[PDB]
């Protein structure tokens, strides 16, 4: 389906968006196996049975059955992965209509990505792409609760405000409340807000892989709401994620250069043991 001007903009359009949506649904339904008839059938069955709200998807089979979608995947991971989540949600509901009461969302994890790089080989060219690396977890914070669907509370008229979905790039700023049209301070409403687990880890190059006259490099990664606790310090892990850059990271502060910090939005974690 190579056509247009920009890959991310190409998926942005509603047309190809729905085309990919239905093609991925048909791939989930139809891709069976060499012999393991409809691997995704029992996959979804087990995930719903244990309430795992996740789906590990091999890249090899997805590329084989739908090469266009696999090609589009790494270029613009955010949009393709969101579409895959949307597709898998209704696929699960079709298989398990009652499971809709559980998490109202499904995450898609991608594994066995073909090209695997090293933390020292990361460059600006890899910005905003699905990338697979390997490393040792050198630090990992607690399971911090991050805002997911905030409902700020207007102080003046005590009216709770609608769900302002939290973005991993920018902090959500409420407008003026619809009722009393006040742009006041507002405060979170924890009782009515819903959150998501937020863990932050650091992944460093395996010492056995570093060269002689070089030091190991490290990159910060964010695990979100299902990959949390999947790692502990000292683990050798293969991490596939988005080399995200545009959240707030830009050393605009004085005595600073226009550098950009980088964090890997984790999408799949595999402990090698």
């Amino acid at each position: 389906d190579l056509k247009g001007h920009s890959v991310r903009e190409w998926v942005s359009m509603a047309g190809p968006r729905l085309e990919i949506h239905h093609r991925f649904k048909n791939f989930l339904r139809t891709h069976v196996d060499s012999h393991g008839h409809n691997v995704f059938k029992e996959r979804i069955s087990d995930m719903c049975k244990e309430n795992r709200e996740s789906l590990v998807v091999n890249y090899e089979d997805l590329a084989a059955r739908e090469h266009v979608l696999a090609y589009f995947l790494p270029e613009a991971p955010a949009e393709l992965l969101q579409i895959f989540d949307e597709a898998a949600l209704e696929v699960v509901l079709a298989m398990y209509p009652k499971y809709d009461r559980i998490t109202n969302h499904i995450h898609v994890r991608i594994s066995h990505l073909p090209l695997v790089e090293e933390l020292r080989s990361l460059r600006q060219l890899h910005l905003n792409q699905l990338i697979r690396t390997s490393g040792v977890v050198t630090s990992c914070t607690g399971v911090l609760p991050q805002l997911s669907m905030v409902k700020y509370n207007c102080n003046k008229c005590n009216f709770v405000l609608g769900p302002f979905c939290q973005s991993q790039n920018q902090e959500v700023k409420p407008g003026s409340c619809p009722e009393c049209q006040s742009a006041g301070p507002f405060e979170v409403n924890m009782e009515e807000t819903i959150y998501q687990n937020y863990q932050r880890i650091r992944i460093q190059e395996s010492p056995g892989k570093v060269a002689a006259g070089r030091l190991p490099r490290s990159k910060d990664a964010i695990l979100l709401a299902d990959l949390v606790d999947s790692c502990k310090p000292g683990d050798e892990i293969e991490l596939t994620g988005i080399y995200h850059n545009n959240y707030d990271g830009s050393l605009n502060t004085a005595n600073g250069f226009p550098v950009f910090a980088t964090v890997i939005l984790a999408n799949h974690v595999a402990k090698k043991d």
Binding site: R8, R120, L122, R123, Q124, L125, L127, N128, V136, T138, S139, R202, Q204, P207, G208, V210, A211, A212, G213, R214, L215, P216, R217, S218, D220, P233, N245, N246, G249, S250, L251, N252, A254, N255, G256, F257, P258, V259, F260, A261, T262
Partner: protein, 590 residues
């Protein structure tokens, strides 16, 4: 729209040079070099300044005296040179890397008169910060009128548009690494601390410099700002980085072989087939040190080393041999250490009490430009895959000796400091020089008593060399003759069969070999170890244990590596056994 006519003319001439310059063969060499510019991870073309001088002298002079104000135009010329030939991405950018600048300048010479113009300097890399994406020109949105101010050029500072004309996904980024260097020893003026100016590296040449390397940086000195105040700091922006003293004129054995030239490989292969290469290397590496053949052989085997291995259970078999030298003063111990340091690359020399724990193993600081932390490499780390020469070892504090013991034990340093943990690798051999307790070696005691080293430290020293100053007249006459001949004829009087550069190249090539151990060699090792244990059945300077079998295996491996052999013949085992047996000295007593 005023046009910088000088810059435009420079661009035109540079493009003409790019599309016209021909090599000796007569082909457009830079066209061939650009052929590879299409592939991603490749956006820099290295252009030798000698070629630029040869083609258009006036253009070269203009570039040298106006490097900064024309560099963007040179990049544009390269982009035009490549675009019209192939189908490179439109948004992809390209950079011009210069090298072989005939003249070099000292860090002390970087006066303001050199700002914004081409120059090459030499320095020693102290530490390299991580690699980041850098914004050169992107997009800006006005929050007052939503008028998008587009492609505002950042000058080493977050520069919003100064006035409204009335994002990331649509911006161009370049790799950026701030690596700190410092002045070389030769350039240091009398009684002055070294100068450090943080050089800045960009795409392609963004990791060509590592901590501890001697590197030549070619580029431009620039000023960075650190009613408003104009506080400026000098900073070097390098378009290319190369080793100051290249090892090869042209990592696996074949890769190193191809890295070399034809003549270098001829030399290396010739010396590999050179019978008696052992003695030739010993003499050439230490021409001014009389006698002490055993110590020379030990340090040579140390420079080569053994073969590291990993056990099925994960246990690590040490494959790098350490050496210690103990004896009376003026036995040329510190001279051995200095020889090894000055000769071997990645060789770091220290003192007894002059180094603290952090500066001797590692330290952590926080990157001044991002949220990540960088690791200041201590002396042990700079010796990674090299050698660390610790003179006056016995004087070293215990708080540091524990770290050295850790490095010898597991080859690694574990740090938990300043908000970051890390397990870093230190594959270093240790050449120690320790004075005997009381300042003189007493022959009527075991080695354990003659020195103030803790038992764990001595345990993992493969070789101990004792240099007693027997007051023999023949030896004194020989030593005096050699020293006086040295001081009479300074430059000459040293006829070393192989130049230090040749030995460096041969060492780098041979280090890649991983000799095996044949069954015959295994049986020979077993018999030799049996005999060496029977030796301890008069008393020796120190007991003989299985660690001596490990040392013998490692020494045989190093001996095999010396001749670039692929299997450890029995002769290597015999030589290692003989050397280790000589290292053991009888504890004579009335």
């Amino acid at each position: 729209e005023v046009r910088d006519e000088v810059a435009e003319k420079c661009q035109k001439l540079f493009l003409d040079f790019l599309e016209e310059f021909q090599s000796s063969d007569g082909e457009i060499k830079y066209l061939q070099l650009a052929e590879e510019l299409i592939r991603p991870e490749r956006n820099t073309l290295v252009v030798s300044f000698v070629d630029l001088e040869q083609f258009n002298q006036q253009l070269s002079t203009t570039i040298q005296e106006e490097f900064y104000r024309v560099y963007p135009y040179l990049c544009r010329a390269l982009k035009t040179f490549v675009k019209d030939r192939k189908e490179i991405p439109l948004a992809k950018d390209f950079y011009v890397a210069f090298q072989d600048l005939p003249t070099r300048h000292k860090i002390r010479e970087l006066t303001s008169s050199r700002i914004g113009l081409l120059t090459r300097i030499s320095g020693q890399v102290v530490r390299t910060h991580p690699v980041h994406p850098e914004l050169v020109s992107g997009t800006f949105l006005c929050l007052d009128c939503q008028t998008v101010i587009r492609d505002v050029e950042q000058q080493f500072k977050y520069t919003q548009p100064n006035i409204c004309r009335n994002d990331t996904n649509k911006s161009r980024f370049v790799d950026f690494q701030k690596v700190r260097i410092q002045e070389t020893q030769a350039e240091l003026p009398r009684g002055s601390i070294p100068r450090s100016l943080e050089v800045i590296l960009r795409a392609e040449a963004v990791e060509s410099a590592q901590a501890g390397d001697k590197c030549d940086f070619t580029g431009t000195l620039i000023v960075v700002p650190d009613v408003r105040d104009l506080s400026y700091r000098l900073v070097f922006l390098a378009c290319c980085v190369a080793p100051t003293n290249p090892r090869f004129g042209g990592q696996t054995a074949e890769s190193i072989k191809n890295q070399m030239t034809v003549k270098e490989w001829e030399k290396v292969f010739e010396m590999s087939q050179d019978k008696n290469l052992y003695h030739n290397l010993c003499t050439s590496l230490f021409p001014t040190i009389h006698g002490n053949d055993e110590v020379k052989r030990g340090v040579l085997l140390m420079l080569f080393g053994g073969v590291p291995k990993t056990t099925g259970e994960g246990t690590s078999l040490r494959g790098d041999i350490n050496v210690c030298i103990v004896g009376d003063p003026s036995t040329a111990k510190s001279q051995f250490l200095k020889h090894v340091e000055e000769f071997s690359p990645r060789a770091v020399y220290t003192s007894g009490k002059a180094s603290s724990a952090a500066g001797l193993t590692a330290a952590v600081v926080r990157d001044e430009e991002s949220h990540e932390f960088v690791i200041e490499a201590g002396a042990l780390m700079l010796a990674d895959n090299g050698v660390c020469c610790i003179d006056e070892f016995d004087k070293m504090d215990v708080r540091d000796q524990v770290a050295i013991h850790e490095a010898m034990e597991q080859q690694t340093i574990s740090i938990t400091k300043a908000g970051v943990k890390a397990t870093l690798n230190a594959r270093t051999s240790i050449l120690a020089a320790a004075n005997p307790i009381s300042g003189h070696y007493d022959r009527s005691k075991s080695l354990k008593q003659n020195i103030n080293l803790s038992a764990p430290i001595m345990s993992r020293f493969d070789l101990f060399f004792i240099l007693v100053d027997e007051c023999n007249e023949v030896t004194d006459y020989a030593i005096a003759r050699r020293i006086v001949d040295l001081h009479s004829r300074i430059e000459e009087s040293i006829d070393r069969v192989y130049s230090l550069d040749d030995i460096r190249r041969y060492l780098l090539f041979a280090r890649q070999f991983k000799p095996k151990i044949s069954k015959e060699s295994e049986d020979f090792i077993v018999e030799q170890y049996k005999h060496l244990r029977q030796r301890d059945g008069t008393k020796s300077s120190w007991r003989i244990t299985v660690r001596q079998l490990e040392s013998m295996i490692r020494l045989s491996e190093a001996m095999a590596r010396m001749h670039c052999c692929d299997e450890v013949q029995p002769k290597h085992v015999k030589e290692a056994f003989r050397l280790l047996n000589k290292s053991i000295i009888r504890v004579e007593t009335p």
